[PDB]
A = this chain, B = another copy of it.
Amino acid sequence: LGHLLRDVWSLLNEEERELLDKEIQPFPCKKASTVFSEGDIPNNLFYLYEGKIKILRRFHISRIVKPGQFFGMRPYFAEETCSSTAIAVENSKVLAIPVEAIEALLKGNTSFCRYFLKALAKELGYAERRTVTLTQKHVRGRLAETLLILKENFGFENDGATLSIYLSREELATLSNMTVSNAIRTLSTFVSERMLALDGKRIKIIDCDRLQKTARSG
């Protein structure tokens, strides 16, 4: 199963690949189940092969993990407990790598180290950007930004306009630092302005260019 970790697998030699194949475990992950909980001591790193995982800690959703990313990596490297709970947004295929195996691999392989260095640096860039967005942008900018981030990370359905992720109003509100009332109020306005169209949990972006202007300008 180690080969499913496409980017990382290419960095490993034959002995390292054997070790990974030996230690990696499938991790059952039904929608709404929890991978780990805030306060937990890290025993594994997790790789999201398929599906979607929300990281949360009012609650705050710090990220929604997309396929091909690692999670639970932060507290391992920081030598801390998990700051957050990880919950599946949909049925997901997760691979667990024991921290002992991770550590052996890191010790022998600077390329493997540098992969995680980039991953953490990227996450930190996103995190610091998000702080500015959430504290400084007004309701319209915050929600538009959230929607464009989901567009970027999860993409569109076959129609090329409907977001391929189906968050509750509560998740969308929390993600964008607003009340559900404000979220539904703002979505309503975005439909009135013909930037979006709504159908249950389905959000269709009908004017992306203008939505982007709203994210940036207000």
| A interface residues (Cβ-Cβ under 8 A, vs B) | 57-58, 60, 62, 73-80, 83-84, 106-110, 113-114, 116-118, 120-125, 127-132, 134-136, 177
Contacts and interface: CB of A to CB of B under 8 A. Distances in A.
Identify whether the interface residues of A are mostly helix, strand, loop, or mixed: helix
Contact of A79 (B76, B77, B118, B120): B118
A76 to B, nearest CB: 8
A83 B125 contact: yes
B113 A83 contact: no
Contact of A121 (B62, B118, B120, B129): B120
Given A73-B121, A124-B124, A127-B127, 4 more contacts: A62-B131, A75-B121, A77-B121, A78-B122
Identify which of A118, A124, A134 gathers the most chain B CB atoms within 10 Å of its CB: A124
A160 B78 CA distance: 30
A121 B78 contact: yes
B118 A83 contact: no
A116 B117 contact: yes
A135 B177 contact: yes
A75 B129 CA distance: 13
A107 B121 CA distance: 17
Contacts of A114: 106, 113
Contacts of A129: 83
A31 to B, nearest CB: 24
A127 B110 CA distance: 26
Contacts of A60: 131-132, 135-136
Given A117-B116, A132-B57, A124 B122 contact: no
